[PDB]
Structures are given as C-alpha cells and as structure tokens.
Amino acid sequence: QFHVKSGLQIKKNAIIDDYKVTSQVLGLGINGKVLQIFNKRTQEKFALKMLQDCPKARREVELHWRASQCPHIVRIVDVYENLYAGRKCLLIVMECLDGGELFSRIQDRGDQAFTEREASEIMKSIGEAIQYLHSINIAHRDVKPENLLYTSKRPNAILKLTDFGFAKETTSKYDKSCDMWSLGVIMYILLCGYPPFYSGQYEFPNPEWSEVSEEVKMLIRNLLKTEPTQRMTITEFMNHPWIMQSTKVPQTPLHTSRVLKEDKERWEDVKEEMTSALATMR
C-alpha cells in the first residue's frame, strides 16, 4: 500500500564494461551529440548524451532523472560519470526514440490528412508532459518541436520530451510559462503551419482559417499573450475542453501537414527562429 521509485545513481565504471558504443551518430543536440549505444546484456539500442560534467549539467540531469518517471517525458536509464578526454565526463544513457520531430512526422502522412481532433491528441499530450515538471516545480525552458520526438515509427507509437539542457526547478512574471508560451506556439503551427512573425500581429489566411471553430482560436489567445502574467497557466490550460477532449473536436480537414509540404523550404527558419524566440526569452 506504500511505494516509491529508486534514487538516482551515478555509476563510475567505464560505461565500456556495460555498453558497446557505436559512433553512428543520432542527435547532434546541445552539448555532445547522441550516439547509438547497445546494452551489453539486453542488447538493446540506446541514446547517449555526453556531458562535460559541471554542477550545472550535473544537476540538469539530476532533474531529468525525476522527470523520466513520466510517460510523455523521455526516460533516463543510467548515468555514468567517467573520464573521456582528460575531464571528468558525464554520460547519461536514455531510451533512444525513433519517431521524429513531431511535425516532421506528420508531413509524410500523405494518405489521409490531419484532423483538428488528431491535432488535439498531440497538443493534448504535450500538455500533460509539461504539467508533471511544473507539477513538481521544474520549468523546461526550451520546448521546441525539435525536442518533441516520437518513440517508434508505428502510428500508435507515442511521443516524448527531451533535452534538459535548459530546464530549472521552479523553487521559491515567473518561469514555468515559457513552457506554456511554446505549447501556444506549437498549436498554431500545428494547424496552419506557421507561427506569428515579430522578433506583434498574427493573421489568419482563408484556405485554412475557416469554419475551424473560432472557439479554439479563442484558447490560443490566452495562451499566446506576449505578457508574462495572464498567459494561461498549464494547470489552467489543462482544464479547458479541447484539451480534456479526445473526441468532440471538429473532424476538420487539416492542411497543416501539406501546408508544410507547401514551402517545406522555410522551416530551418521556423524550427530555429523558435529557439531564437525561445531560450533568449529570459
């Protein structure tokens, strides 16, 4: 009737006893890249983030540990601190995830488009994800559609949030709201296929912005506030129907996917100007 999960554990034996390291690259995210790695015993393939090892990261990971305990958050599995070059390293090993940057995955649906109801599902989940962190006092601070990846390529295959190179524990407008901001950011693009455009006004083109419930077009408002305050807290955010919906959302045809195919070329812009938009945002 009473339970916990294990504490975080820094193994010190050269991961090389415990795994076999490829060089086959994966993510080339923040600090160090991401390497295919296979667990010797099990023989399963794995993400490996390489870290300099300094209190910062050393905590950043420290939180991740707690966070992984989440469904929609990427789970860490083992965290060795060894010695690569000549400097006390830090290798955090986590479930690899081959589903792809959420969006990039949708724009190859081809057969059948996307649905406002299916768009929910995505956003819907993302919500939960954020909650947890906040709901324990962590703010992610970088919620890019780069860092929303899927597990497998099987269509049921769920998606998760990663790269804790940014987050903080919300201790003692605030912090845990950029995370909101982004969700907002996310939804927009999730429907048309672009964000706003400042560094202002965000317009609503015909062929996509239509009978598409102005009701939804409401929420997004409270979400997007260039304000810090009044940007609808996640705690808040969850409550609203569309979120807790699953099934009553408009069956609308979503151009979103193909919207992107239409001018796939301007995204390295989008995808990235977002980090610009983000990160720097305090």
Add this chain to the structure above:
Amino acid sequence: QFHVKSGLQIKKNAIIDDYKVTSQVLGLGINGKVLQIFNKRTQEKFALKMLQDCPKARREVELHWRASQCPHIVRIVDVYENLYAGRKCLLIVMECLDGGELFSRIQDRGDQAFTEREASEIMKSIGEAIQYLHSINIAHRDVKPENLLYTSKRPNAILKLTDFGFAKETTSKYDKSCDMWSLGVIMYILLCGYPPFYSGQYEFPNPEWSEVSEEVKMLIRNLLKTEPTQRMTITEFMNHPWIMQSTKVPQTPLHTSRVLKEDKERWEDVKEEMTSALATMR
C-alpha cells in the same frame, strides 16, 4: 593495533527492496514522522525518519552518522536517498527505541520512588552523550526531554539522544552550551519536577527542596547561568563529583516522579515551553 569505523554510505536502491515499510506511526517529530520498519533479512523493527533532502538535512544526518558511533547516542544504520512524491527524498533508518521520553518513564515507577543517586545516573549519562558531540565539535541545540528516550522498557535498559534536526558542527558566547543549559534545565525538573519560569528567579519549595544536599543545589547554579559565558562547559561539567559519582549521592527519597503525577496536566506546557525556551535561544 590500528582501527576505524566505516564511512557513511548513501544507498540509492528503493529501500523497498531492503525493508518492508509499515504505516504504523511512531514519532511525529521534526520533518517526516517515524515509521515502524522491518529489515527484510534480519527481520528486526526500525525507526525511519523521512527527510526532504537538501544540503541542510543532508548534512545534519551526515553528522548523526558520526554521532551514532556513540553509546548513549541513537545509532543510524542506513540512509537511503530515494524518490517518494516527486522529490529526491532521504530516508535515514535507525535503531528504533521503545523506552520513552526519559521523564515520562520515571513517573510510572510507582513501587519505590526515585533517588538523588538514581537521578545522577540519568543526568550522569546525558553528560557523556553531550561530551562526544562537542568532543568532536558538534552542538546539539535541542536537548529536550522529548529527545531523551530509552531503548527498551526493561529497567536496566539504557537511554539515548536523537533528532539531529538542530545540531551543528562547532567549527572555528558560543554554541555548544545550549546543550549545557539544557542538562541544567533537565536536572532541576529531574528533582522537584518543574523548571524555572520566565520567558528571572527560580525558588525552592519545602516538601522536596530540603536536606537534599545544598551541595548539589550548588552545581545547578554554574549550569543555569542565564549567561552564555560561565555556564560551566560540559568538559568542565563532567569533572565534578556528583557526575563521576555513581555511588555516594544522597539516598534521598525523590518526589520528582510522583511530583509530576501531582499535576501531570501541566507538562504539555513544560515539555514544550522548553522547545520555546530552547531552539529560539539563538
């Protein structure tokens, strides 16, 4: 010809592999309560203090470890840092102790009263206890007759000091003296059955304060000084006869026990105003 004891060790595997946790409560002291807990292998019952886990506690315990190495100080046995709620916990497991808040144990002697010579024994011991901590540079800072408990209910069964939620290492009037103060505090009540009463003068009623060696009534003085300086250091405190006595102290009948029975009702006052008196005292 050369020796040590082991270092402190933070196990990280969910204590749930290593113990079976009840919910049967015990102490409801400082932070977290105290739970009956049984060691799987041995199958012995145990105290478990639950801690938030922040440098403070995380050190407070850290000292306790060293301290336990003492007879009259409660011994820690294992200290897991896991994850309860959503926050890196800290579970320190120690020998449970069912003898009771020193005093509360005496006021049920009934058959035969207490003896100035037997009162020594108690105080006598408590002294040692303090020494150690100080004698390694730790000040306890909370020495309540709540935190002086006995092991078993068998009359030989000794007593020990606990709850390190307060102490410090005396590094670099001072600090390690409140601990004195309290011993003082303790002895008084240990004889009549009350403390002073300020927030001043401490009087000496007939039916108890009597042929009871004014000699003892001396020491207590040097102990009680509302001063910081000149409150007889423990190092000092030990030297005096009555302490190193065991056997020459007056065989006096002590009302103390029954003294308390006489107005048991005002104690929640006593017992507690002491923490008030204490703690806050710097």
Add this chain to the structure above:
Amino acid sequence: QFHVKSGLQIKKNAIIDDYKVTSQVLGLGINGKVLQIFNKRTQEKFALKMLQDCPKARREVELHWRASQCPHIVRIVDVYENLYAGRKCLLIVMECLDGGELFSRIQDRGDQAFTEREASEIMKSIGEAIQYLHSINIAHRDVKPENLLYTSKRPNAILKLTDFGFAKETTSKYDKSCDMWSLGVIMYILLCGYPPFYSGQYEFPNPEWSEVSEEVKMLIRNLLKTEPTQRMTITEFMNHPWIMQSTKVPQTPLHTSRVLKEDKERWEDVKEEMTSALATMR
C-alpha cells in the same frame, strides 16, 4: 575504436576490510604521513596518504585521479573516505615508490659520474609530466625535488611526481608557470649542484661551468625569468632540442652528483628554501 578510463570512485567500507595497515612510516609529507599498506588480495605494498576530508583536499585528490592516468605522474589506485578519529577521513591509496628524491638518488652513483645527456633524460621526463597537468588545465604549484621520486632502485627504474596538496585546475601573469620556474630551478642544481640565492644574480663557477655548451646555459635563461610572463611556457619548453634530444647532448662529465657530496650538509637548506621559494611564490 573508442575508449576511456573509469571514473573516480569513493569507496566507503573501512579500508581495513580491503587492506592491512602497517604503522611503518614512509613519507611524512603535507597532511597525514605515508604508511606502508598491503593489498589484501594481491598482497602488494602501498602508499597511503591520510586526509582530513574537506572540499579542498577532496578535490585536490579528485584531480590527482585524472593526473595518475599519466606515466610520469604517481598513480592513485583507491580512495576511501572513512572515519578515523571522529572526523570523516579520506584515505587515498597509491602505488608506493621506492626510488628516492631524484637528486638524492644521483649522489650515490659513485661508479661513473653523471652526463649532461643523462641530466636531460631526467629534466626531459619531468617536462612531460608537467605538460599533462597543464595540457588538461592543472597547475602543480610545488614541484620540489622532494616530490620527484623514483619507482624502484633499479637504474632503469623511472621517476614520478606526487603530492597534490598544492595544485589547481587552470580554469578560465598566470599560474601553470611556477611549474616551469621549478623545472628551471631543477636543471640548474641538476648541473652544478646549487640554485641561485636571493629570496638577483646567479653566477657560474669554473670547475663545472665550462665547455658545457653555453647553448644549454641559454634555455635556462628563458626558463628562470624572475618574470611571470616570458618564462617560457612548458608547451614551449618542450619544443627545444635539448628536451626532445635523448641523444646528442654533450657527454660532459657532470660534477653535479659529487658536487653535492661536496657539501652535502647544505641541502636541508637547498631542498627546503625551495619550498620557501616555492609555495609562497603566490
């Protein structure tokens, strides 16, 4: 095709399970002495440095770990943090080394003297040693001919650098140059058999300072600069011929060894005034 070494590991089980401790003293260096110690399993003899255990040391060692990964640097093998007296100790165990304070070892060659070419070898090596530390951003800060010891007494038997009670990681004239300074210091004495003498001018007596390539007498210059800047960095220092030489250096007879025999008595002065000279030097 990809590799590391293991991370540093603080064992906590009383070393007394893992080794048998003598009392036979060895080094009486910085903090704690040096004890013969034998590894239970292997049954090999070992150095043991005893440390108070405070962040400082606790890091000082922490670096040593990385450093040991070096040939010419003394290797640490195990680092227990236990409880001696009453205070969280720290016992770092390393390969013992019975070859002797570099110099002291040379002044008993007797049969055949020393060679400028053989003097290189020594200095030559020492160079490398320093490089590493610096080459990973550690400055040793104490490079005395006390801390340059040999492994065995067999003449091939190499020598290594020890006592990290002083060093720092060179993070963010500078720091990692005292180490240079000393090398300089070392070479001089390595040839005549004294240093300079200030607290100034360093002269060059006949019977030793002779056809002995003024070319070498050059380098030493750039090394010795009472300056902080322009004291030839090690990175630099290495490049020059004499260093990378091994074999083209003058076959000169070196009085050095016997030079010391000649007035062995003034050395406790030399050997030590060096620490004076050193250490304090910022």
